[PDB]
């Protein structure tokens, strides 16, 4: 993983929002948390191949802070609509 990535993920705030992993300016992965901090740092020892995957693959890291749950669930809905990004599934 990009060190730049891994510093991101270890000064995300315990905070609800969604999240999103790019390479060359195109969303790969979309996903939503109660609290950006704890989600994001399951990253830094992947419990799946595709986890594995999206953290090496990635070449940049944008995160998005929320309201509530309630935002959250509705923002990460859409983007993944819009998007369709290849690790979401369809
Ligand atoms: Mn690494
Ligand atoms: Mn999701
Ligand atoms: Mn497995
Ligand atoms: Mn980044
Ligand atoms: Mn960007």
Do not use: W
């Amino acid at each position: 993983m990009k060190e730049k990535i891994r510093k991101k993920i270890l000064l995300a705030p315990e905070e609800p929002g969604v999240f999103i992993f790019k390479n060359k300016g195109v969303p790969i992965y979309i996903g939503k948390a109660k609290r950006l901090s704890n989600r994001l740092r399951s990253y830094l020892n992947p419990q799946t191949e595709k986890v594995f995957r999206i953290g090496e693959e990635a070449d940049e890291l944008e995160t998005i802070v929320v309201m509530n749950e309630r935002e959250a669930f509705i923002l990460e809905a859409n983007l993944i609509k819009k998007y369709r990004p290849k690790y979401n599934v369809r």
